Design a protein around this ligand. Structure first.
Ligand code: HEC
Length: 250
């Protein structure tokens, strides 16, 4: 969720250039951003982010049932650029932004905006209303070409803030061996007993509901061998743009 990165990464872009959602949102899937080539001081412009996916896809929801995807994004602007105020947003633009609430990544970072989770059917392309700064009123903003970075995610992530896996990832055998028993559970899920004949050790790997097994009793499994399908139909991607803050003369 945008809140898990905000709660524990102070800045969303790491030194490698990867945005921190990729730490738990593990599949890669394309993101796009259109931004005007150039903008004038103190004018509103739109940055439109596309987070595309095949919409007949159903993911495994937190309780085993299958459902639709939700989308979220993090937009990293230059310092000085910020969310356009309501009075400066046009009516033709206010129906375009639906009724999204863009939040600041942290109150002091006015130039990093997050939005989501919002339903994917409705918001696969999102319009962020940005106000361009004015050099004459800000001594560190110049007429220059500026980088803009976006991260876009659709679907539930794989790892939670404490390091726990969710049920929207592969479950791997914690031991090699032969499966001696597979107990299909009452309300869903499985209990798999592995006899690691090599270590004379018995281990039981538990599998959550919404996942289907790739293994049979009597089969030899290796350590970390996938025991289930990969149920993840979503993914995170990132992209970048360059904008020219333009002198109103030449
Ligand atoms: C790990 C600590 C994570 C970070 C950092 C981010 N996300 Fe995440 N996200 C994570 C999990 C485990 C889940 C699933 C929660 C559940 O049980 O359902 C999510 C979910 C989302 C969603 C909703 C998906 C849906 O309902 O279909 C979105 C839109 C989402 N996350 C976006 C997102 C973005 C853009 C992030 C970077 C700023 C981000 N997440 C970070 C785990 C983690």
């Amino acid at each position: 969720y945008p809140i898990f990165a905000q709660q524990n990464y102070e800045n969303p872009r790491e030194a490698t250039g990867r945005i921190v959602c990729a730490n738990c949102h593990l599949a890669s899937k394309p993101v796009d951003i259109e931004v005007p080539q150039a903008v004038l001081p103190d004018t509103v412009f739109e940055a439109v982010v596309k987070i595309p996916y095949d919409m007949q896809l159903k993911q495994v929801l937190a309780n085993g049932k299958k459902g639709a995807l939700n989308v979220g994004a993090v937009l990293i602007l230059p310092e000085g650029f910020e969310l356009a105020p309501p009075d400066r947003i046009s009516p033709e633009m206010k129906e375009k932004i639906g009724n999204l609430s863009f939040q600041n990544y942290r109150p002091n970072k006015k130039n990093i905006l997050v939005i989501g989770p919002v339903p994917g059917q409705k918001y696969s392309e999102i319009t962020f209303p940005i106000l361009a700064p004015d050099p004459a009123t800000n001594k560190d903003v110049h007429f220059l070409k500026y980088p803009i970075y976006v991260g876009g995610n659709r679907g539930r992530g794989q790892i939670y803030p404490d390091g726990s896996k969710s049920n929207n990832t592969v479950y791997n055998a914690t031991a090699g061996g032969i499966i001696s028993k597979i107990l299909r559970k009452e309300k869903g899920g499985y209990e798999i007993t592995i006899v690691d004949a090599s270590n004379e050790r018995q281990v039981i790997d538990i599998i959550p509901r919404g996942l289907e097994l790739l293994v049979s009793e009597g089969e030899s499994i290796k350590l970390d061998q996938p025991l289930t399908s990969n149920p993840n139909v979503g993914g995170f991607g990132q992209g970048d743009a360059e904008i020219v803050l333009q002198d109103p003369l030449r």
